[PDB]
């Protein structure tokens, strides 16, 4: 809608960016437990998969993990080591040694007010998984900065997908939720010093068997329900 004028060459929108290094690390996760099944996405980094804490509403079954290297199944989710991100819908799963690790080239940082972001995903139904990038939205913190607002259309099942800065290609958060009318979307922001956490074992606090115990939670100033209506 905007016709530019009185510009500098540097004022133009950023040119093509290769999002394949990010999409090639995305995994599709299915936690099947107690008659329920929850599916959403995660981001691989080394031996870790970064995903939504609500994946673990339940923790008493199996975890199917679809990635670039194929499909792997964790027989008992309670054996998985987990690192919780305090007060955010984010958790890090440490995969067992027999799961092929991911590279460690991705960069994560806290989002910046008003910056332009896009949502990146991977299509697994195609024989060969294919990378997907959405149109661009600006972003702002909702409250204390735990959840950030975004205006990218997302379908059910895309939680965990990375929100990426078109400015520097860094991942600034993961998709988490919407209001009841699907008119405002929210992602969970990457916390401060996240790169330190991913690369310094002293900073990690691993537990196993952890789950949520309710159908709604109060994070970042919002009450969030597990299911809509």
């Amino acid at each position: 809608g905007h016709h530019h004028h009185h510009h500098h060459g540097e004022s133009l929108f950023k040119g093509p960016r290769d999002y394949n290094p990010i999409s090639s690390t995305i995994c599709h996760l299915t936690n099947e437990s107690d008659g329920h099944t929850t599916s959403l996405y995660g981001i691989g980094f080394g031996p870790f998969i970064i995903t939504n804490k609500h994946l673990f509403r339940r923790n008493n079954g199996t975890l199917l993990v679809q990635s670039l290297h194929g499909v792997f199944k964790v027989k008992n989710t309670t054996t998985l080591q987990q690192h919780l991100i305090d007060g955010r819908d984010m958790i890090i799963i440490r995969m067992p040694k027999d799961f092929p690790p991911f590279p460690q080239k991705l960069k994560f940082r806290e989002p910046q007010r008003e910056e332009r972001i896009c949502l990146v995903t991977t299509n697994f139904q195609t024989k060969s998984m294919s990378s997907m990038v959405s149109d661009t939205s600006c972003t702002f913190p909702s409250s204390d900065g735990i959840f950030w607002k975004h205006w990218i259309q997302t379908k059910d099942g895309q939680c965990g997908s990375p929100l990426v800065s078109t400015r520097d290609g860094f991942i600034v958060g993961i998709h988490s939720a919407s209001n009841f009318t699907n008119t405002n979307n929210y992602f969970t922001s990457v916390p401060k010093n996240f790169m330190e956490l991913l690369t310094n074992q002293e900073a990690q606090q691993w537990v196993s068997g952890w789950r949520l115990n309710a159908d709604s939670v109060l994070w970042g100033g919002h009450k969030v329900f597990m299911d809509k209506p």
Binding site: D89, S178, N179, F180, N184, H222, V224, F225, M226
Partner: peptide
């Protein structure tokens, strides 16, 4: 506002 995990 109230939100729901998607």
């Amino acid at each position: 506002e109230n939100l729901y995990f998607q």
